[PDB]
Design a protein around this ligand. Structure first.
Ligand SMILES: CC[C@@H](NC(=O)c1ccc2c(c1)nc(C)n2Cc1ccc(Cl)c(Cl)c1)c1ccccc1
Lengths: 10, 258
């Protein structure tokens, strides 16, 4: 749903 | 007491590790190897390489717009690493974290943008360039009023004379905002925000003992940031309905249902 933000938080 | 001090120095050090151009550095430049100044069409052409842009390879305003877009993607990245440093942020549910950052970034981007501004223009390219307020104002509609509101806020905000050890906490407060639409577990966010708002309060009491009602003045500003975002989003709507203009997907991910 917010893929880039997720991967920035991972 | 000493907890809130240890948290102040923690965020200040994270801030320094996370953001490469700080108010300290920007101010040195703005009051000083001078920046290249872009003040008109021909100086934009002469200084185009100052504007950081990586791509495959067309109107003047679109290129500025693209430039700002390019750099915002990177500010988002910076802010994210910073949030990951605010104690307990990483321990929240990973869907809330995304929402806080989602609505948080514009407010933060415009707060820090003030650091690079004075009444006449804004630093670009990590201080390598200076683009004048007047030049931006001259760009054809609707790009003539893209930056102006930001300059209007900056001047007001800069008059508070905040430094980096102050903005470090102010910025952390904004991220941990409790009224972001669609938040699942609201309680833990507000606990930390309450704990950061008290830290901010002490930080302004020691660092600025003369300027009365600064904390007051500082929370008030945090309401205008939201107004500036509102105007911005509304202006993006106009651009999106008349131009042919393209938005980065990290940005699109932030603007969708905002
Ligand atoms: C939050 C996204 C939003 N970003 C901005 O409004 C914006 C504008 C100027 C900025 C900025 C962020 N960051 C900085 C250092 N500057 C100074 C600045 C001013 C002029 C130039 Cl040419 C450049 Cl490269 C940088 C956005 C969205 C869609 C489209 C374009 C923008």
């Amino acid at each position: 749903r917010h893929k880039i933000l997720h991967r920035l938080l991972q | 007491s000493a907890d809130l001090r240890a948290l102040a120095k923690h965020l200040y050090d994270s801030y320094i590790k996370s953001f490469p151009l700080t108010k300290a550095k920007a101010r040195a430049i703005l009051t000083g190897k001078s920046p290249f100044v872009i003040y008109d069409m021909n100086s934009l052409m002469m200084g185009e390489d100052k504007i950081k842009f990586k791509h495959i390879t067309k109107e003047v305003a679109i290129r500025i717009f693209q430039g700002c877009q390019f750099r915002s993607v990177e500010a988002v990245q910076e802010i994210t690493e910073y949030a990951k440093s605010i104690p307990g942020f990483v321990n929240l549910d990973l869907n809330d974290q995304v929402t806080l950052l989602k609505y948080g970034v514009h407010e933060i981007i415009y707060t820090m943008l003030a650091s690079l501004m004075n009444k006449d223009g804004v630093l670009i390219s990590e201080g390598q360039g200076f683009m004048t307020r007047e030049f931006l104002k001259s760009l054809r509609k609707p790009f003539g009023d893209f930056m102006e509101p930001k300059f209007e806020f900056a001047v007001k905000f800069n008059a508070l004379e905040l430094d980096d050890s102050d903005l470090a906490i102010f910025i952390a407060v904004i991220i941990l905002s409790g009224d972001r639409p669609g938040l699942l577990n609201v309680k833990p966010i507000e606990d930390i925000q309450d704990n950061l708002l008290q830290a901010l309060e002490l930080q302004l009491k020691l660092n600025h003992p003369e300027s009365s009602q600064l904390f007051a003045k500082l929370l008030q500003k945090m309401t205008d940031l939201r107004q500036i975002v509102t105007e911005h989003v509304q202006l993006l709507q106009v651009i999106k309905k008349t131009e042919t203009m393209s938005l980065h997907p990290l940005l699109q991910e932030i603007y969708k249902d905002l």
